[PDB]
Design a protein around this ligand. Structure first.
Ligand code: A1H2J
Length: 257
C-alpha cells in the first residue's frame, strides 16, 4: 500500500453515458418488479419455526427440504421473469435462454437471499417471505452452501448495495459465455461487456467510502459462481437422498443433467 491515496485520487472514475443510463434504468426496473416484496420484506416476514431444521454425517432433513421446495418454483420463476425483461436476452434463441438460466439461476437466487441478510437475527430472508437460520438452510439440503450464502450476506452489509447494483450484478451473472452449448456467443459476450462497463460507471457514480470497492465487488462474482457450482453437487446429493415426489417439475428442469 505505497502511494495508495494518490493512486486513488489519480484514477479516472467516469460516470455512465446516456446510452449506459438506458441499460441501468431497464435492468433496475426488471429487478425491482421481479423482487416483489423487496420494498416491505423486513416488515412482513414469517420466520420458519425453530423445530424445522434443528440440529448419518450428511443426511437431509426432509421436513425442511419440503418447506424450501414449496417456495422454489416461484423463486426460479422470478429469475426467468427478470431475464425476460432485459432486451439482449429475449431476442436470443430458445436453447441459449435455457443454457444461460441453467448456469446462473442459483447464482441470482443466492445473491438475492444474501442482500436480505439481517445482522440482528442472523437470518436470510428467502423470496421476501421466509426468514431462515443457517442451520435450517444447511440441513434442508444446501449443506456447506448455506454457510457460503450466510458468509456472503455478512460481507455484503458493508457494501450498501442498492437495487441497481444488485440488478446489474444479476445481469452480469446471466450473460456469461462460460457455459457450453451456446449458439449466439458473440451477442452474449458483447452484452456482458456492456453491462460490466455500465456497472463500473454506476459504481463510480455512487462513490462508496470503501477502498478498492469495484475490485472487491468483482471478487463476489467468484463467490457466487462457487455457490452455483457447489449447489450442482448438492442437487445430486438431494436427488439421491430425498424422495422424487418432493421435487417440483421446474426445479428438476433447471438443475438436472
Ligand atoms: C434446499 C434447496 C431446496 C434449495 C434452497 C434454496 O433456497 C433459496 C430459495 Cl428457495 C429462494 C431464494 N431466492 N430466490 C429468488 N428468486 C429470490 O428473489 N429470492 C430468494 O431468496 C434463495 C435461496 Cl438460497 N435454493 N435452492 C435450493 O436448491
Amino acid at each position: 500500500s505505497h502511494m495508495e491515496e494518490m493512486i486513488r485520487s489519480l484514477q479516472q472514475r467516469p460516470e455512465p453515458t446516456p446510452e449506459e443510463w438506458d441499460l441501468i434504468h431497464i435492468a433496475t426496473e426488471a429487478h425491482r418488479s421481479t423482487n416483489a416484496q423487496g420494498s416491505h420484506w423486513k416488515q412482513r416476514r414469517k420466520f420458519l419455526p425453530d423445530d424445522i431444521g434443528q440440529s448419518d454425517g450428511d443426511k437431509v432433513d426432509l421436513e425442511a427440504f419440503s418447506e424450501f421446495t414449496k417456495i422454489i418454483t416461484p423463486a426460479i420463476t422470478r429469475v426467468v421473469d427478470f431475464a425476460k425483461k432485459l432486451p439482449m436476452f429475449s431476442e436470443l434463441p430458445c436453447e441459449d435462454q435455457i443454457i444461460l438460466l441453467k448456469g446462473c439461476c442459483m447464482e441470482i437466487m443466492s445473491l438475492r437471499a444474501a442482500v436480505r441478510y439481517d445482522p440482528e437475527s442472523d437470518t436470510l430472508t428467502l423470496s421476501g417471505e421466509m426468514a431462515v437460520k443457517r442451520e435450517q438452510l444447511k440441513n434442508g439440503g444446501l449443506g456447506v452452501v448455506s454457510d457460503a450464502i450466510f458468509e456472503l450476506g455478512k460481507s455484503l452489509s458493508a457494501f450498501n448495495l442498492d437495487d441497481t447494483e444488485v440488478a446489474l450484478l444479476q445481469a452480469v451473472l446471466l450473460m456469461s459465455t462460460d457455459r457450453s452449448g451456446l449458439l449466439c456467443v458473440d451477442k452474449i459476450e458483447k452484452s456482458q461487456e456492456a453491462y460490466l462497463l455500465a456497472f463500473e460507471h454506476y459504481v463510480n457514480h455512487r462513490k462508496h467510502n470503501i477502498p478498492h470497492f469495484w475490485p472487491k465487488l468483482l471478487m463476489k462474482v467468484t463467490d457466487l459462481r462457487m455457490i452455483g457450482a457447489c449447489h450442482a453437487s448438492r442437487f445430486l446429493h438431494m436427488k439421491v437422498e430425498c424422495p422424487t415426489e418432493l421435487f417440483p417439475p421446474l426445479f428438476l428442469e433447471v438443475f438436472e443433467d
